[PDB]
Amino acid sequence: VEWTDKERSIISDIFSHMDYDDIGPKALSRCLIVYPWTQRHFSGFGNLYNAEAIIGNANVAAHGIKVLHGLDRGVKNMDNIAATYADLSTLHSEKLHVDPDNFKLLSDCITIVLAAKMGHAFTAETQGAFQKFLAVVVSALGKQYH
């Protein structure tokens, strides 16, 4: 991707206004409910018995906040994303055995949670830039061939 200045501005604006402590837990708990096979990676987090337990789970919350902060390194250098995430990609694949499909599922949950928070400010152009950015991170994490 050859980012436009507008895309860079939109991504910077979104991440500057994002409350990671609110959005992070909601995105991951939403992923664990909508795509519940992803719960397998978090068996040690305590209560994941039903939606109420997952949403309230503080270990899930901490991890979702980690994910969002994990996007910061991409935001800070949008022209070096594949290289920036090479080590995280190795961790999730060789140590954690996360299926590469799971990155796209969580990214869609982040987009849907951000859309709920931003409401009508989540314009089509905002969505396009934010999803493009996540797609580039997802490709780096999933080690997609290109």
């Binding site: 708990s29 939403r30 409910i33 909508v34 519940p36 939606a51 949403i55 869609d108 987009t111 849907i112 949670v113 859309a115 709920a116 928070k117 931003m118 409401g119 009508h120 989540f122 089509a124 152009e125 969505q127 396009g128 999803q131």
Partner: protein, 142 residues
């Protein structure tokens, strides 16, 4: 497949949000054409396909009327959406890869407009349902 729990959840969500179907459809089509510009070609016969177009707004009413039809036909989506399948496959020749794109855009719009109602449990059943709608719309393709 949809369980009784999924069907009840979708019907209860639709009961809540269906008043705004036309607005949901306008916004979802508007987003699909901008964010997934490969879809614009299918609407290019309309005099206006630009942001704010009255043709997009009019068509959004029809799309979400198709979703309302699917809610009504949720116990048998293949039979319920067979005519729409034939229309998309044979008259319109819409590539079936695009159904999941519009479905995601509908989820994004419902999240923007009904954040309280669109909980994770509402979302899992609605996503299962939209997957079933896409499969039913795919019925006449091959």
């Amino acid at each position: 497949s949809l369980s009784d729990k999924d069907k009840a959840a979708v019907r209860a969500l639709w009961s809540k949000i269906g008043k705004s179907a036309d607005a949901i459809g306008n916004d979802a089509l508007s987003r699909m054409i901008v964010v997934y510009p490969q879809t614009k070609t299918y609407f290019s016969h309309w005099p206006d396909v630009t942001p704010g177009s009255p043709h997009i707004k009019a068509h959004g009413k029809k799309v979400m009327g198709g979703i309302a039809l699917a809610v009504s036909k949720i116990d048998d989506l293949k039979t319920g959406l067979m005519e729409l399948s034939e229309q998309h496959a044979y008259k319109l020749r819409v590539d079936p890869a695009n159904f999941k794109i519009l479905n995601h855009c509908i989820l994004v719009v419902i999240s923007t407009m009904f954040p309280k109602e669109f909980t994770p449990e509402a979302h899992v059943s609605l996503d299962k349902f939209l997957s079933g709608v896409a499969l039913a719309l795919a019925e006449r393709y091959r």
